[PDB]
Swiss-Prot record:
Family: Belongs to the prion family.
Entry remark concerning the domains of this protein: The normal, monomeric form, PRPN(C), has a mainly alpha-helical structure. Misfolding of this form produces a disease-associated, protease-resistant form, PRPN (Sc), accompanied by a large increase of the beta-sheet content and formation of amyloid fibrils. These fibrils consist of a cross-beta spine, formed by a steric zipper of superposed beta-strands. Disease mutations may favor intermolecular contacts via short beta strands, and may thereby trigger oligomerization.
Quaternary assembly: Monomer and homodimer. Has a tendency to aggregate into amyloid fibrils containing a cross-beta spine, formed by a steric zipper of superposed beta-strands. Soluble oligomers may represent an intermediate stage on the path to fibril formation. Copper binding may promote oligomerization. Interacts with GRB2, APP, ERI3/PRNPIP and SYN1. Mislocalized cytosolically exposed PrP interacts with MGRN1; this interaction alters MGRN1 subcellular location and causes lysosomal enlargement. Interacts with KIAA1191. Interacts with ADGRG6.
Free-text function comment from the UniProt entry: Its primary physiological function is unclear. May play a role in neuronal development and synaptic plasticity. May be required for neuronal myelin sheath maintenance. May promote myelin homeostasis through acting as an agonist for ADGRG6 receptor. May play a role in iron uptake and iron homeostasis. Soluble oligomers are toxic to cultured neuroblastoma cells and induce apoptosis (in vitro). Association with GPC1 (via its heparan sulfate chains) targets PRNP to lipid rafts. Also provides Cu(2+) or Zn(2+) for the ascorbate-mediated GPC1 deaminase degradation of its heparan sulfate side chains.
Note: This protein is produced by a bicistronic gene which also produces the alternative prion protein/AltPrP (AC F7VJQ1) from an overlapping reading frame.
Effect upon mutating N3S: In schizoaffective disorder
PTM field: The glycosylation pattern (the amount of mono-, di- and non-glycosylated forms or glycoforms) seems to differ in normal and CJD prion.
Lineage: Eukaryota, Metazoa, Chordata, Craniata, Vertebrata
Annotated compartments: Cell membrane; Golgi apparatus
Disease affiliated with this protein: PrP is found in high quantity in the brain of humans and animals infected with neurodegenerative diseases known as transmissible spongiform encephalopathies or prion diseases, like: Creutzfeldt-Jakob disease (CJD), fatal familial insomnia (FFI), Gerstmann-Straussler disease (GSD), Huntington disease-like type 1 (HDL1) and kuru in humans; scrapie in sheep and goat; bovine spongiform encephalopathy (BSE) in cattle; transmissible mink encephalopathy (TME); chronic wasting disease (CWD) of mule deer and elk; feline spongiform encephalopathy (FSE) in cats and exotic ungulate encephalopathy (EUE) in nyala and greater kudu.
Record's protein name: Major prion protein
Amino acid sequence: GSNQNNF
Ligand SMILES: [Zn+2]
């Protein structure tokens, strides 16, 4: 699956 990390 697609992953996004918004630190
Ligand atoms: Zn994946």
